[PDB]
Structure formats: C-alpha cells, structure tokens
C-alpha cells in the first residue's frame, strides 16, 4: 500500500486541504514549495518540506525520491496567461518518477478535457492548452496515471459522498476543494481509475 507521497501544488486551494487530509489519514507526505510561508502552522503538517521549484529538475528529483506515489495539484492561481508551467513541471515529475522507481501519479487538470473542447471560455483557453500538454505528458509516460478532471472547484464542506464518472457527465458541475482532495487520496488505494479520466462532482 501507498505510505509515502509527494504532493506538488500543496499550497494552492485544493493542495492545502489535500495535504491536511493526507497527513490526517496517515500518509508520510513530502511537499515541494517555492515559499514555505504559504504552508499553515495550524492543523496537520507535512513530514518533509522541500523548498524549490517544479521547473527545476533537481528540486523535483529531491521531492520524488523514495515516494510511493505522487499527487499533482499544480496550477497558475489567477494567472490566465499562456503558460507551460504545469506541463514542464509534469515533464520533470515523470523524469524523477522514472529515475526513482515511482510508478503512480494522480494529477489534476480540468473537466474541459472531457467536455466539448470548443466550449472552453476564451480566457481559460491558454491554461487549458497547457492542461492538455500536461495530460499528454502523463498519459505517454508509461506510468500508472489517474487523470482527475474536475468541474468548478468550490468551498463546500468535505462530504466524501461525491460521484465519480468517466465521461464528464455527472450530478453537477461543482466539486468542493475538500472532496476533490479526498478523491485524489482515494485514487492512492485503488487501481480502478489507472489509465482513465475521472470526473468528480456532487450536489451540495
Ligand atoms: N478553479 C477551478 O474551478 C478549477 C476547475 C477545474 C480544474 N482546475 C485546475 O485545478 C488545478 C488545481 O487548482 P487549484 O485552484 O487548487 O490551484 P492553485 O490554487 O492555482 O494552486 C497552484 C499550486 O501550484 C503551485 N505552483 C505553481 N507554480 C509552481 C512552480 N513553478 N513550482 C512549484 N509549485 C508551483 C502553487 O504554488 P504557490 O503557492 O507557490 O503559488 C500552488 O501550490 C489547477 O491546474 C487548475 O487550473 C481549477
Ligand atoms: C460558472 C461557474 C464558474 C465560475 C464563476 C468560475 O470562476 N469558474 C466556473 C466554472 C468552471 N471553471 C472551470 C475550470 C477553471 N476555472 C479556472 C479559474 C479561473 N476562472 C476565472 O474567471 C479566473 C480569473 C480564473 C483564474 C484565477 C481555471 C484556471 C485556474 C487558474 O489558472 O486560474 C480552470 C481550468 C470548470 C471546468 C468549470 C465548470 C464547472 C461549472 O460549474 O460549470
């Protein structure tokens, strides 16, 4: 079973609660963060903190070494500019996984990669193009990859009661950040989504 995990993007909206949940659930968690002041003091704390950048291969390598699995919650916060941060980060993550024998990655992109790809709002198209490059990197890696493709990420409570479909259709177009993190952790204990795209959603 998975015991040790690396989380990328642990200081973001979904990352923070995924990290807290993972520690509370018993995982030994390593995070890569550019700025450690973005980690909280209260609540559950990661076992290991690497300060650095997902665009630096050595930093990623140090974070992936010795892990059982990797969670990817990289994003651009409010920046909608053309970008390759997520896909280049994923390239480094894949190389570090292969260098260290790690074979399980659960990574978040977005439901736009399931929905009609001509239905993306213009201001999200640049970020979505890099999600598509990241998804390609991970699908072509030869590793066990769960693609998590959520709809709008909300702040509703943790429920653990959301629905997961494989095609982008579901009870709603929202998932709470807490439920999304819960689902990323669920993917560590089953192979049933390996090689699949998944759509978590719930009516809150
Ligand atoms: N918002 C929505 O409704 C929605 C819906 C579906 C999919 N998504 C996608 O879901 C994913 C998760 O979104 P989120 O809102 O939880 O993310 P977020 O709040 O944007 O957080 C992005 C995370 O990535 C880290 N990061 C960015 N650049 C990095 C770099 N060069 N090196 C290391 N770490 C870096 C950020 O670190 P810092 O703390 O250092 O900035 C932060 O931890 C994103 O890809 C987003 O596009 C969002
Ligand atoms: C109608 C409800 C709604 C809303 C008021 C939003 O802000 N997004 C949204 C719905 C969705 N956003 C999605 C993806 C998304 N949002 C986002 C963030 C921003 N939206 C913005 O306007 C700005 C500015 C953002 C950046 C700060 C992304 C890039 C993340 C990033 O780079 O920002 C991505 C990818 C997605 C699959 C949705 C369907 C779910 C549904 O309910 O249909």
Curated annotation (Swiss-Prot):
Query: One of this protein's GO BP terms?
Result: heme catabolic process
Q: Which reaction does it catalyse?
A: reduced riboflavin + NADP(+) = riboflavin + NADPH + 2 H(+); bilirubin IXbeta + NADP(+) = biliverdin IXbeta + NADPH + H(+); FMNH2 + NAD(+) = FMN + NADH + 2 H(+); FMNH2 + NADP(+) = FMN + NADPH + 2 H(+)
Spell out the subcellular localization from the entry: Cytoplasm
So what does mutating residue 110 to A actually do? Abolished NAD(P)H-dependent reductase activity
What GO molecular-function term can you cite, just one?
Answer: FMN reductase (NADPH) activity
Q: Which tissues express it?
A: Predominantly expressed in liver and erythrocytes. At lower levels in heart, lung, adrenal gland and cerebrum. Expressed in adult red blood cells.
Q: What keywords is this UniProt entry annotated with?
A: Cytoplasm, NADP, Oxidoreductase, Phosphoprotein, Transferase
Phosphoserine carried by residues = 41, 81
User: What mutagenesis or variant effect is reported for residue 77 to G?
Assistant: Decreased affinity for coenzyme A
Q: How is its activity regulated?
A: Mesobiliverdin acts as a competitive inhibitor for flavin reduction, indicating that flavin and tetrapyrrole substrates compete for the same site. Inhibited by a wide range of xanthene-based drugs, such as phloxine B, erythrosin B, tamibarotene, sulfasalazine, olsalazine, febuxostat, ataluren (PTC124) and deferasirox.
Domain of life per record: Eukaryota
Gene Ontology, cellular component aspect: cytoplasm; cytosol; extracellular exosome; intracellular membrane-bounded organelle; nucleoplasm; plasma membrane
| Record: active site | 108, 187
Task: Name the Enzyme Commission number(s) assigned to this protein.
Answer: 1.5.1.30, 1.3.1.-, 2.6.99.-
Q: What is the effect of changing residue 187 to R?
A: Abolished S-nitroso-CoA-dependent nitrosyltransferase activity
Report residues binding NADP(+): 9, 11-14, 34, 37-38, 53-54, 74-75, 77, 86, 108, 131, 152-153
Q: Name one Pfam family in it.
A: NAD_binding_10
Task: Report quaternary structure and partners.
Answer: Monomer.
Q: What is the annotated role of this protein in its UniProt record?
A: Enzyme that can both act as a NAD(P)H-dependent reductase and a S-nitroso-CoA-dependent nitrosyltransferase. Promotes fetal heme degradation during development. Also expressed in adult tissues, where it acts as a regulator of hematopoiesis, intermediary metabolism (glutaminolysis, glycolysis, TCA cycle and pentose phosphate pathway) and insulin signaling. Has a broad specificity oxidoreductase activity by catalyzing the NAD(P)H-dependent reduction of a variety of flavins, such as riboflavin, FAD or FMN, biliverdins, methemoglobin and PQQ (pyrroloquinoline quinone).
Family recorded in the similarity comment: Belongs to the BLVRB family.
The protein here is known as Flavin reductase (NADPH)
Q: Which organism is it from?
A: Homo sapiens (Human)
Protein's gene = BLVRB
